[PDB]
Amino acid sequence: GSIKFWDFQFATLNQSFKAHDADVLCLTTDTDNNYVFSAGVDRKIFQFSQNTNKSQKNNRWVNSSNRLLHGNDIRAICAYQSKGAD
Amino acid sequence: AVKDALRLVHLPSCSVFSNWPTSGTPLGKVTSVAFSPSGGLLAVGNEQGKVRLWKLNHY
Amino acid sequence: DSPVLQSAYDPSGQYLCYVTVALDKQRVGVQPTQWNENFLYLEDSKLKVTCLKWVNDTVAIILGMNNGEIWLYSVLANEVTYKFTTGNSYEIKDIDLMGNQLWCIDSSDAFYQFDLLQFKLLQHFRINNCVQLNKLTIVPAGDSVAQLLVASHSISLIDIEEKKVVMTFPGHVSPVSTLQVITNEFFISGAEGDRFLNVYDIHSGMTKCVLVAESDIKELSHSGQADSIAVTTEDGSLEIFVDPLVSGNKSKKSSKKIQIVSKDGRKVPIYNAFINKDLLNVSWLQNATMPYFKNLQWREIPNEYTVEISLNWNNKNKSADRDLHG
Amino acid sequence: MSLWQLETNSQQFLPRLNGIIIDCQVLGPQGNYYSLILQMTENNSNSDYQFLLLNASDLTSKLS
Amino acid sequence: QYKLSVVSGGKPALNNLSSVTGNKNIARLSQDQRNYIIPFNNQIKVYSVETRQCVK
Amino acid sequence: NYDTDFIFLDIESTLGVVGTNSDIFAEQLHKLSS
Amino acid sequence: STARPRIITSKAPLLPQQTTPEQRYWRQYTSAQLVKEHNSVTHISFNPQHPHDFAVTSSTRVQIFSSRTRQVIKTFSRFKDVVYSASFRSDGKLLCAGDATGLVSVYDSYNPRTILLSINASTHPTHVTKFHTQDNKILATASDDRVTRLWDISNAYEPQLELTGATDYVRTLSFIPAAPHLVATGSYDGLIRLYDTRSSGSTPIYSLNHDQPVENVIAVSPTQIVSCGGNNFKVWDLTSNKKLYERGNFNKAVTCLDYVENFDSPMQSALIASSLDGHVKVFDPLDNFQVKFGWKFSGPVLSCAVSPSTAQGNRHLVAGLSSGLLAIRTKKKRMMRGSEYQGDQEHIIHNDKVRSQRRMRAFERNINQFKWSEALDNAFVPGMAKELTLTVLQELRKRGKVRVALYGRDESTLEPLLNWCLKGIEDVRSASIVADWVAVVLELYGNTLESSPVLQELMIDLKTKVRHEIHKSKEAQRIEGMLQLLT
Amino acid sequence: KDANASHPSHSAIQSLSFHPSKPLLLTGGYDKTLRIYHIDGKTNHLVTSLHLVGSPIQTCTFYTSLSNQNQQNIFTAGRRRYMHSWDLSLTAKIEKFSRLYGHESTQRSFENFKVAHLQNSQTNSVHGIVLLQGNNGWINILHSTSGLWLMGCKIEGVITDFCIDYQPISRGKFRTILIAVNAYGEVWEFDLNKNGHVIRRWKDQGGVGITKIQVGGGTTTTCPALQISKI
RNA sequence: UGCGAAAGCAGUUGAAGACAAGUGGCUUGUCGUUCGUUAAAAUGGCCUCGUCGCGAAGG
């Protein structure tokens, strides 16, 4: 369940979360990466955010919102945006 | 690890101090070393349960 | 052994001025003898003090150092006020004042006069047949600047205007350590390493009495009229001679013996007591440097006295927020 | 008493304060003391509060 | 010759309002953080934190 | 209360009993050392 | 903060035969080892100065056992007839054995190859012999020559004292344990005698008459002695010269006694007795010689003895039966040099290490972790016990909700609740919790009772169990009524 | 003279340190005690000697706060999970730091720590910080006074040791830097006056099994400052 | 809600206002609204501290 946000250059861990409770199986984002939506095998799909300007000045992620939606699992996820659909 | 296993190196010219850490010094199995902030005291604590205290004359 | 290098009581027993070592410097300090701690360090290890004395109009200390200076140092203000000097870099071995007249011996056998109201040198002179010097004392006969008493391994009563030796006493087999004038004619002396005090007439050279103690001495303190002299011995005891100028006929044994034993069975040493009329200011190092005191009533305690003090030895740290069973 | 570090949304818990909490905030010079105003609701008769503050070191109480 | 005499203290008596304040605590620490000044309905206690007595 | 008086209690809950140059140098040093 | 309250275990309330500490201390005597012998185990004595050995007296064969391992360690079999009395000297060094030929022999301990000396007693069987308690070198032998004698073992040739004055079958001796000049004997006409050894010793200075022929005379104090004959034991006091207690709680004649003082027990003094019936019973000389506990063996117990006051190891009760065997019921009592420093000379010592609690139960940590249905499920596992199940049921009643603990069940997991409740409804202390628990489960699961067929037979025989229990409680209420009549 | 002459010790002296202004040499070992000598040339004596039963102390060190210079804490940690904080103002009380807040599965032990200052970069609230060796690749920092978690940085491999650089920015304002080694030789240096993210990572030219790193020459743990601008 | 015994005894239940929703009016619901009568429903549940020989800038 440890959703970990690694830095790309210098190749190490920017921050971490032990948010989930079991196997995380998939995740996604949007087109300019203010959100990361993770979803695992205990069906709790939750959304980490970077929306505020000071949080993107620090470029640090919060454990913003949670949602349970399902009966048994999640095994895949996807996201889409437009100017008429998201 | 071994007995009498401490050395001091002169840092700007990175030389090694020859005369002091000789076999007539009772360093013992050295397991801690610490400098004083201003007096130039040098404490070396060994495994047998004591700490000897040298003084550097230059400081 | 003491980490206090050397200490001196003020007259009328109120403040103890003591110098200890603290990481190759000299932590000097003044402590009241009923919390005074912000007192100075000098610079490096090659500037240690050698003698010190009070001056009681402000109140101050003089520190005869070893580099060649005397430092007149205030106590209320923390800084050194003035730096008396000779022209030589030689080690001042003892200093003694009398009113305004100050007098310091050297280690290179000289004598220097000074005055702490005009702040300048007066006379700069040596004499023959005094090959080492480590004590001197201006004599009390009012403003008797003349006829001072120098002392090293034998005691020489020397004039300041005839400027030569007028009497010579036999000293010890060691360099002298304590020489103090107790009357207008008697002075006590005693070297270190030996247990023998001898008092001398200043007008005959006859050793009137010999005081003995159970160890060699560190410092003596007499009363205001020479009827009680308390020495501190090197094994950390206090020996008080009562009425030492009466007549057990030539050599007086010690009368009062006060030693301080804590309530865990550990002997703590006593250095530099002070006895005015019917009190006793016993001083002792509780922790490694900070000293404590006791104002003991002097004439009423028995012949020996084990003063008890409390000290942490195995006390369970009961907290202010926990209980006994945790 | 639940204190939540916000960078992971994770808690440290103090389990039982013999009373419900009404007001609590930090009050140190840099945040080394936690005030607490607890109320002890198991009697519905009186409004009998209980003041305590406690240092953040090991969460031990001080002067209830 | 009897008399009544108040001897002992009561409840701490905070700002007991009906949600008119979210800061329902009027105790205080001194700026030397060693003394807790706390009002009562009957007293004004001053405690010392390292000893936990009513220091005045 | 068995010390031969009485103790009552309020509801504004209080309790009550039915009852029957060295000195100047030392002062300046204590001032200046702080 | 504070600590966590330990989940209590509400045990059985005040049922009769309540657990008293004397019967606790005697109850912890376990491991009754039974050892065969060849004939009736007549006499058993113990080792005084190192209480670690005891001597048993079979026919023609005296054995000594040790208390550390409880096996036979030495024998003594140079006996020309049946051997009767085995006793020890008070320095624990020499064993005196009176046999039936009359040549009463004393060996030393652990060396049966050397008979130390053979006292020639009378032609009659020397039935009891024992050493003096105070003095070492005087030895009392009573034969059935209606007489007893005191021998000095140094001057072993002649009777030092000739104590006559007893009529029929002198059988026991005991010495008054403060004044060593007072020797107490018993005979088979009653009339417990005692003599002053400084006197001529041919008549008792005062006699005490147990009406039954006395079987054992022991001393428990300088003041009072204990003599037994018939189916009762009687305590006499010498200062009042009078019988002052008698207990008769047996069937047949009591055959041996002894006493133990100041040993490790809540009961200070203890006098135990063997009774030829199958029972050995302990009596408490503090509170008027009441019975306290009794062990039952498989035949007429002919002698018994307990380990002495200072046994320092495994403490023993032993009893030789006349059937030919023996019962032993026992009770049993260079880099890390500084890491044991433990703070001797250092100034200030700080100590706040919390002791580790004993390991919490599965249901205890389940209720503490609030998983209530899992607490109930791990509670009704057949590896648990009755009081533990009753206390977790009481806990879920008092704190949580039984509705919550049953809000997610089905046909399957509701079975072991009722299956426990069948056994639980019948007894006393559980039936209220059984009652409201099955009441709330049938309140909450009525439609599943309509659908599912399995627990219907559980409800049926629960109805039968309730009818059986209401019949039993109704007749018990009738007994309560007739006791209210008889008061 | 021998610094352990007036009072004998009993285990290996596992850590020595000095008070950064006062003449006190602090000594601690595996005999679950910690003494503090007052030291000079001819002699040296004991001042206090606290003794913690149950717990050894693998490393123990002074700490003075930079702002007020009147805190004088002792931070003593052994092979267990807790470290102990002593306050010095002249019996005596201590506190038992034992609560990692969010991250309890990353501290097998408090076996190695350091102590370092930090100015908080939006206001000049200079406070101390203890820094712990992790178990996988972590290094947690904490708060010296309160005991909050602040952040935990992490490298790969094994954390073997680490050291604390300082660097000034303006008058009376400084940013610290934690330098931490791998067990292979590439080290990470990240500042932590902002949140702890890596500002440089570089490889030791050679070196395989590396075991200790120490920076200095300016100010560090063995010689901190007392004025803030003396950094 | 009142009495009283741990059981039971006698009796409440409205008026107005605001706001919302749904079908300009009209139906339904909530009250950090007033007077008067003694009158279930946000995946959210309680921490660690049981842990692992000697030898003062050579012999």
UniProtKB/Swiss-Prot annotation, chain A:
Present with 5440 molecules/cell in log phase SD medium. It is found in: Nucleus, Nucleolus. It comes from Saccharomyces cerevisiae (strain ATCC 204508 / S288c) (Baker's yeast). The gene is UTP4. This is U3 small nucleolar RNA-associated protein 4. Interacts with snoRNA U3. Interacts with MPP10. Component of the ribosomal small subunit (SSU) processome composed of at least 40 protein subunits and snoRNA U3. In the absence of snoRNA3, forms a complex with other t-UTPs. This complex can associate with pre-18S ribosomal RNAs. The lineage of its organism: Eukaryota, Fungi, Dikarya, Ascomycota, Saccharomycotina. WD repeats lie at residues 12-49. Involved in nucleolar processing of pre-18S ribosomal RNA. Required for optimal pre-ribosomal RNA transcription by RNA polymerase I together with a subset of U3 proteins required for transcription (t-UTPs).
Curated annotation (Swiss-Prot), chain B:
Belongs to the WD repeat UTP18 family. Disulfide bonds: none annotated. Involved in nucleolar processing of pre-18S ribosomal RNA and ribosome assembly. WD repeats lie at residues 25-58. It comes from Saccharomyces cerevisiae (strain ATCC 204508 / S288c) (Baker's yeast). Interacts with snoRNA U3. Interacts with MPP10, UTP21 and UTP25. Component of the ribosomal small subunit (SSU) processome composed of at least 40 protein subunits and snoRNA U3. This is U3 small nucleolar RNA-associated protein 18. It is found in: Nucleus, Nucleolus. Present with 9570 molecules/cell in log phase SD medium.
UniProtKB/Swiss-Prot annotation, chain D:
Involved in nucleolar processing of pre-18S ribosomal RNA. Required for optimal pre-ribosomal RNA transcription by RNA polymerase I together with a subset of U3 proteins required for transcription (t-UTPs). This is NET1-associated nuclear protein 1. It is found in: Nucleus, Nucleolus. Present with 6560 molecules/cell in log phase SD medium. The chain holds residues 321 to 384 of 896 of the full protein. Coiled coil: none annotated. It comes from the Eukaryota. Interacts with snoRNA U3. Interacts with MPP10. Component of the ribosomal small subunit (SSU) processome composed of at least 40 protein subunits and snoRNA U3. In the absence of snoRNA3, forms a complex with other t-UTPs. This complex can associate with pre-18S ribosomal RNAs.
UniProtKB/Swiss-Prot annotation, chain G:
Its main location: nucleus. PROSITE patterns: WD_REPEATS_1, WD_REPEATS_2, WD_REPEATS_REGION. One of its GO terms (cellular component) is small-subunit processome. SMART domains: WD40. Keywords: Nucleus, Repeat, Ribonucleoprotein, Ribosome biogenesis, rRNA processing, Transcription, WD repeat. WD repeats lie at residues 36-77, 78-117, 123-161, 165-205, 209-246, 249-293. It is found in: Nucleus, Nucleolus. GO terms for biological process: maturation of SSU-rRNA; maturation of SSU-rRNA from tricistronic rRNA transcript (SSU-rRNA, 5.8S rRNA, LSU-rRNA); positive regulation of transcription by RNA polymerase I; rRNA processing. It comes from the Eukaryota. The keyword Ribonucleoprotein applies. The keyword GTP-binding does not apply. GO terms for molecular function: U3 snoRNA binding. Interacts with snoRNA U3. Interacts with MPP10. Component of the ribosomal small subunit (SSU) processome composed of at least 40 protein subunits and snoRNA U3. In the absence of snoRNA3, forms a complex with other t-UTPs. This complex can associate with pre-18S ribosomal RNAs. Present with 358 molecules/cell in log phase SD medium. Involved in nucleolar processing of pre-18S ribosomal RNA. Required for optimal pre-ribosomal RNA transcription by RNA polymerase I together with a subset of U3 proteins required for transcription (t-UTPs). This is U3 small nucleolar RNA-associated protein 15. It comes from Saccharomyces cerevisiae (strain ATCC 204508 / S288c).
